[PDB]
């Protein structure tokens, strides 16, 4: 599809059998999702924010559907205020920026 | 141009005759720029991130040129490590996401 930017580019995603909303973010290297029960192996990771660090769970080789398109990649799961789909998955669905 | 997302979508912007690098960020409502000297009046503002808020200065009606497109809009100036072009300007240059 063509997504315009008059509104936030929020789309439906499916991951671990669950539907959620997530922001397509060309500025993000990485994909960060709200706390969530996900099966499988993960690695602990720390990220430094404004007031301090957050701990997240890194899941690699995860299958995620983004606005209908299947994609495989790394997702970080933790206390984020918004679900962010970053470039690591946007490339996998063939997403381009056009103007 | 058409921009793939395998690398950060960094472009050159022109603001007050100066050339700076900035990131085209579909996930950002607003445009946020590093400490610089813009002329005239501003309004104090707060932008939220992980674990807190950053103080910024909001300037209206600023001319920014991006890949030949001339946008006029609101910019937030603050201690951002990266210049962020948000949807307020991305919509003015005709930017869409496509996959």
């Amino acid at each position: 599809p063509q997504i315009t930017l008059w509104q936030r580019p929020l789309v439906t995603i499916k991951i671990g059998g669950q539907l959620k909303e997530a922001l397509l973010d060309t500025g993000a290297d990485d994909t960060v999702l709200e706390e969530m029960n996900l099966p499988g192996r993960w690695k602990p990771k720390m990220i430094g924010g404004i007031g301090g660090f957050i701990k997240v769970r890194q899941y690699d080789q995860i299958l995620i559907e983004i606005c209908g398109h299947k994609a495989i990649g790394t997702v970080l799961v933790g206390p984020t205020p918004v679900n962010i789909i970053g470039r690591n998955l946007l490339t996998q669905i063939g997403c381009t920026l056009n103007f | 141009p058409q921009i793939t997302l395998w690398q950060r979508p960094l472009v050159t912007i022109k603001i007050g005759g100066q050339l700076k690098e900035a990131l085209l960020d579909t996930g950002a409502d607003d445009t946020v720029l590093e400490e610089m000297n813009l002329p005239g009046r501003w309004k104090p503002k707060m932008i939220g991130g992980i674990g807190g808020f950053i103080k910024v200065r909001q300037y209206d009606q600023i001319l920014i040129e991006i890949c030949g497109h001339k946008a006029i809009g609101t910019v937030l100036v603050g201690p951002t490590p990266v210049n962020i072009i948000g949807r307020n300007l991305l919509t003015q240059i005709g930017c869409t996401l496509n996959f």
Partner: peptide, 8 residues
């Protein structure tokens, strides 16, 4: 690295 979350 997610600039809108101020994460780098």
């Amino acid at each position: 690295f997610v600039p809108v979350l101020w994460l780098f």
